[PDB]
Amino acid sequence: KTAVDSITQKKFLCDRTLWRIPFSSNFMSMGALTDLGQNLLYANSAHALD
């Protein structure tokens, strides 16, 4: 009945895991060799990543 005013904190834990960002068109796992991996621009050229 005499509770004091409050403020909420949210956090999450995820251990024993690796974040993944697949290099695929729709992020799905449509196979080992993703279509973007076979995309001709990435296949017949050079690029720089930042």
Binding site: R20, P22, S29, M30, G31, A32
Partner: protein
């Protein structure tokens, strides 16, 4: 040049496994079956022991080596 004689015989018929089974697995997109399904502050004793027994044993559906058990229905946990 026929290697059928090397295989176990299931009765007048060699036990030739499926040719479509040669391994392939990688980081993502490769999943295999048989998943990780699973001073007492609390004295209940009972369910506790029972639970420990459960913890040491197993159950699933593609465990179809041999037989499922009599009358039937086809179910999940594929």
């Amino acid at each position: 040049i026929n290697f059928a004689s090397l295989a176990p015989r299931h009765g007048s018929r060699p036990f030739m496994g499926n040719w479509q089974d040669i391994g392939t697995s990688n980081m993502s997109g490769g999943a295999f079956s048989w998943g990780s399904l699973w001073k007492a502050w609390n004295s209940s004793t009972g369910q506790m022991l029972r639970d420990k027994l459960k913890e040491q044993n197993f159950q699933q559906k593609v465990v179809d080596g041999l037989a499922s058990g009599i009358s039937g229905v086809v179910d999940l946990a594929n």
